[PDB]
Amino acid sequence: KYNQVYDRSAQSFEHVDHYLTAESWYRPKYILKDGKTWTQSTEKDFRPLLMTWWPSQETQRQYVNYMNAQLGINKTYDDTSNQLQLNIAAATIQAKIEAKITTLKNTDWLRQTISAFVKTQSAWNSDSEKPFDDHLQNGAVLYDNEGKLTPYANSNYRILNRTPTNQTGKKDPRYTADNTIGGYEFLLANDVDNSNPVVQAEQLNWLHFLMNFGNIYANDPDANFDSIRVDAVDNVDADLLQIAGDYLKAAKGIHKNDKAANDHLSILEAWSDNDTPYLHDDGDNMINMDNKLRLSLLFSLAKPLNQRSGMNPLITNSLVNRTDDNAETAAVPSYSFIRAHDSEVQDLIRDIIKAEINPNVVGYSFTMEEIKKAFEIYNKDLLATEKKYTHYNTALSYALLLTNKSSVPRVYYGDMFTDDGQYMAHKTINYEAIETLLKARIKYVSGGQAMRNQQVGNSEIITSVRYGKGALKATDTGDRTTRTSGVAVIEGNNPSLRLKASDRVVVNMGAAHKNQAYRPLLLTTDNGIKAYHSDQEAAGLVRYTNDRGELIFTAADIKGYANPQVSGYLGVWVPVGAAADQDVRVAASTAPSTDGKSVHQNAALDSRVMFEGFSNFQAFATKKEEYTNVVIAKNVDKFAEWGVTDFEMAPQYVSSTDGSFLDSVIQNGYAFTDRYDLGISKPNKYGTADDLVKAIKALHSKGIKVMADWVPDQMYAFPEKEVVTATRVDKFGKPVEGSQIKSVLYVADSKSSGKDQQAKYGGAFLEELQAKYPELFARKQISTGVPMDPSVKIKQWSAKYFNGTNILGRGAGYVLKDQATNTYFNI
Ligand SMILES: C[C@H]1O[C@H](O[C@H]2[C@H](O)[C@@H](O)[C@@H](O[C@H]3[C@H](O)[C@@H](O)[C@@H](O)O[C@@H]3CO)O[C@@H]2CO)[C@H](O)[C@@H](O)[C@@H]1N[C@H]1C=C(CO)[C@@H](O)[C@H](O)[C@H]1O
Ligand SMILES: [Ca+2]
């Protein structure tokens, strides 16, 4: 009777949405002070609810056993423990607890011990959330749409799995490269409901903010983000692809001509093979990766010698059949790459961890210790010829990427610099070859392409040829600038490649290059790869074409090698006698686009070079001059020298520290809490907001456009709690068969600060946008059938704007329940 509630007022409990949890404390009518006198209880005398209440006899017995063992009491009560025997034991436990409280006059040990005991109960930990599925964080929980117990978080939407393939709910029949629905809605952390028109409008607001970051933050139009990279296209409602499209038109006029489109060249991270034709049918407002060419490169050059495939795919298995690409404008624009901050980097780290560290590693949720231990092996393997974990023939992949036509190459930072360590600190063994190839791409690479696969000796070789500036076909003759341009690349993927004397590899170079002298650019040696940085530096190894413009090679030149850079043969030749400042690139015409497509893969777009300027595993910064953006501002001249046109920067948002995923362990910037906190409140991994502005300004100085990561899928770890009606679900959002979480209350962390940059800039510019661009809000979106709803600005992120959250390890009955009436405790 003494241990009841002081007053049934909300201030007497530790509530969440006026509900009670297992770890909740309360203020009783009387405190058993020191365990002797029943004293009236002040406001600072909160006590754990579990000290005097239990949601079943079993849990009470477990409480008795655990606290007896923890406090020093001998006797523990077994299976058949009578009802009242447990009550008297709990009274003894309370007496001992208050006695030990007065002996220390704090209540920290009690908090810790109660938390531990709660975490030892079945329905208060992961056990009630199991079975785990293929979610990157073990499981998912979908917030119910009509939660009677919590209208706090309802929604008329939460439309799931609306990928570009599955935008309308049924799989699109127009695209059949992918059997599946082309993605899944639940990827990581708290999943943003991008099917809510309010959230769509807020995403448009965030996009406008990012595109005008300079003006909005430092009153400087020189420091605006030029382009965007839409992250996790396959995990969000694809209506955003229209919204981001529309805007890029209405706000920047990319549809009008080609110069605007190229000045705001936006890309997608869409993995499903259906996404590139879906985007081409959308109107080519953005460009998608060439996944086919990526896989061809990976499986023909990078894989170990056992698992390496033939070389023919490198020609045919792509978006452009580069057998004879004699076209002024390619059918579909694309950007190609071999590695990225995630693709074929964190995968290799996972492989190493699962092999020689922690075989039980779950998804990509690494620990920093595991990361460093694995990186030791990674850095050693990168330097060996016999590679167990890392890529072979990286230089060959980049030699093909930077000479290919009809695609925009994206050079990854971690292929020129160490994936770990400080930014642009230590170079890789391939740095020289890649830099030489970029400079030679500026100087020589232009015109039509021709690729040939020749079976010679015991193996095969491939020859990629660029005819030169102006020469679109082999028959075209061009002019003097044409003759000093063009390039030949000869690659083999077998170290055992040995030709006989009777074997000759013929390489047609184009009608422009008849009887011309050619000098080696890159050459494979036993050392590694010799780069020739000028005609002089290689004048000892000149060779000539015949009267039909054919380079001819034999066993003297082509043989199999096996060194830490080449598992095969690499030979790149350029014509002799080009000006040291010769440039074969083109700028985009101002002529009005006519075909209804915004971005065109013309000769001007082929001249662009994307650069992914960050690694996931960048070492943290000690001093100012080690910040990433500072070093970028310092070394902008290097990027200008390399021919970089679009610099894809890391996501500059400030990182959370929960550690539930790799993104929040190395703090790349994809795990964030405030979407507008671009290094404002705190510095990000790469520098303060002012450092970012300086970097953007320095990049714009040399004419380089800047690309910002647009990440509308998920947000990590909000500070405020919230109780929601929810159901256990897989990554596809299907309810788990007979889980204990079925329309059940759950304590998610889905309430934003409310005094962050999200409160400041949230929906600020909406009023402006429908002023200047009304048609953006006229469009009836595809998945929803209704236009964006900018009426309400999103100042505080609530669970109503979210599809759900990864399982949190809190339990299915973590929200307390009166076992008599079988309803949750309310207030
Ligand atoms: C997490 C990261 O990748 C996610 O997508 C993965 C897919 O689930 C995989 O299936 C894989 O697709 C391959 C399949 O064979 C098939 O889909 C094919 O068509 O394409 C692939 C061929 O090899 O692709 C991914 C491999 O991990 C997710 O969809 C993607 O958006 C994610 N990328 C970034 C996202 C976030 C969000 O926080 C950031 O952490 C990083 O920027 C990246 O991780
Ligand atoms: Ca999603």
User: Cα Rg for the chain, rounded, in angstroms?
Assistant: 31
Q: Residue 400 and residue 491: Cα distance in Å, rounded?
A: 9
Ligand 1 atom showing the smallest separation from residue 709 Cα:
42
Structure tokens at 2: 């003494």
Q: Residue 416 and residue 638: Cα distance in Å, rounded?
A: 12
Name the CATH architecture for the domain at 130-286+599-608+645-781+795-810: Alpha-Beta Barrel (3.20)
Contacts of 667 (CB under 8 A, 6+ apart): 620, 655, 657, 684, 685
Q: Provide the total of helices (H) and of strands (E) in the chain, helices listed first.
A: 21, 31
Burial 531-548 (b: 16+ CB within 10 A, else e): bbeebeebeeeeeebeee
Q: What is the DSSP string of 29-40?
A: SEEEETTTEEEE
- The values of phi and psi at residue 508, to 5°, are -70, 130
Residue among 723, 728, 730, 727 at smallest CA distance from 800: 723
Residue among 763, 825, 818, 768 at smallest CA distance from 794: 763
Structure tokens at 760: 């400041």
CA of 278 to the centre of ligand 1 (A): 18
Burial class (CB in 10 A: 0-12, 13-18, 19+), 167: buried
CB-CB contact of 713 with 191 (8 Å): yes
Q: Residue 567 and residue 432: Cα distance in Å, rounded?
A: 18
Residue among 348, 466, 337 at smallest CA distance from 397: 337
Residue among 812, 793, 826, 798 at smallest CA distance from 154: 798
The domain spans of the chain are 10-125, 130-286+599-608+645-781+795-810, 288-293+305-327+337-344+391-586
Three-state helix/strand/coil letters over 76-90: CCCCCCCHHHHHHHH
Question: What's at 397, amino acid-wise?
Answer: S
Ligand 1 atom showing the smallest separation from residue 272 Cα:
19
Question: What's at 417, amino acid-wise?
Answer: F
Bridge-based pairing of strands 802-806 and 140-143 is antiparallel
Q: Which residue has the CA at smallest separation from atom 11 of ligand 1? A: 271
Ligand 1 atom showing the smallest separation from residue 271 Cα:
20
Burial class (CB in 10 A: 0-12, 13-18, 19+), 69: exposed
Name the residue with tokens 């993605």: 183
Q: Which residue has the CA at smallest separation from atom 8 of ligand 1? A: 183
Same fold, 130-286+599-608+645-781+795-810 and 288-293+305-327+337-344+391-586: yes
Q: Residue 248 and residue 260: Cα distance in Å, rounded?
A: 10
Residue among 745, 653, 758, 670 at smallest CA distance from 713: 670
Q: Residue 228 and residue 292: Cα distance in Å, rounded?
A: 23
Q: Residue 167 and residue 161: Cα distance in Å, rounded?
A: 8
Helical axes 239-252 vs 275-282, angle rounded to 10°: 40
Name the residue with tokens 């590695």: 339
Structure tokens at 306: 């056992």
Q: What is the DSSP string of 285-312?
A: SSBEE-HHHHHHHIIIIIS-TTT---ST
Q: Which residue has the CA at smallest separation from atom 13 of ligand 1? A: 271
Q: Which residue has the CA at smallest separation from atom 35 of ligand 1? A: 232
Structure tokens at 812: 């299915």
Burial class (CB in 10 A: 0-12, 13-18, 19+), 52: middle
Q: Where are the alpha helices (DSSP H) in 126-256?
A: 197-211, 213-218, 239-252
CA of 188 to the centre of ligand 2 (A): 8
Name the residue with tokens 């709990």: 90
CB-CB contact of 416 with 609 (8 Å): no
Q: Give the method of determination.
A: X-ray
Structure tokens at 601: 């893969």
Structure tokens at 699: 């990049």
Ligand 1 atom showing the smallest separation from residue 347 Cα:
27
Ligand 1 environment, Cβ below 6 A = 187-188, 231-232, 234-235, 269, 271-273, 291, 342, 663, 670, 713
Ligand 1 atom showing the smallest separation from residue 713 Cα:
37
- Cis ω for the linkage preceding 575 (within 30 of 0): no
Structure tokens at 19: 């509900």
Q: Residue 533 and residue 693: Cα distance in Å, rounded?
A: 34
SS3 label, residue 147:
coil
Q: Which residue has the CA at smallest separation from atom 38 of ligand 1? A: 670
- 459 has which bridge partners? 456
Bridge-based pairing of strands 646-648 and 705-710 is parallel
Residue among 693, 603, 703 at smallest CA distance from 263: 703
Burial 562-580 (b: 16+ CB within 10 A, else e): eebbbbbbbbbbbbbebee
Ligand 1 atom showing the smallest separation from residue 180 Cα:
17
Q: Residue 616 and residue 420: Cα distance in Å, rounded?
A: 8
CB-CB contact of 354 with 361 (8 Å): yes
Question: What's at 574, amino acid-wise?
Answer: V
The span from the first CA to the last CA of the chain, in angstroms, equals 20
Residue 140, number of CB atoms within 10 A of its CB: 29
Q: Which residue has the CA at smallest separation from atom 44 of ligand 1? A: 342
CA of 233 to the centre of ligand 1 (A): 9
Q: Residue 385 and residue 381: Cα distance in Å, rounded?
A: 8
Q: Which residue has the CA at smallest separation from atom 28 of ligand 1? A: 232
Q: Residue 680 and residue 122: Cα distance in Å, rounded?
A: 42
CA of 663 to the centre of ligand 1 (A): 14
Q: Given its phi and psi angles, is residue 253 left (phi above 0), alpha (psi -120 to 50 degrees) or beta?
A: left
SS3 label, residue 73:
coil
Q: Residue 387 and residue 567: Cα distance in Å, rounded?
A: 10
CA of 271 to the centre of ligand 1 (A): 6
In CATH terms, the superfamily for domain 288-293+305-327+337-344+391-586 is: Glucansucrase (3.20.20.470)
Burial class (CB in 10 A: 0-12, 13-18, 19+), 797: buried
Distance of CA 40 to the CA centre of its chain: 56
Ligand nearest to the CA of 158: 2
- The values of phi and psi at residue 372, to 5°, are -70, -45
Q: Which residue has the CA at smallest separation from atom 5 of ligand 1? A: 271
Q: For residues 777, 782, 784 and 790, what is the CA-based torsion angle, rounded to 10 degrees?
A: -20
CB-CB contact of 519 with 485 (8 Å): no
Name the residue with tokens 């690349």: 489
CA of 341 to the centre of ligand 1 (A): 12
Burial 635-650 (b: 16+ CB within 10 A, else e): ebeebeebbbbbbbbb
Name the residue with tokens 């890159």: 522
Mutation pick for ligand 1 pocket among 165, 267, 271 (CB with most ligand atoms within 8 Å): 271
SS3 label, residue 268:
strand
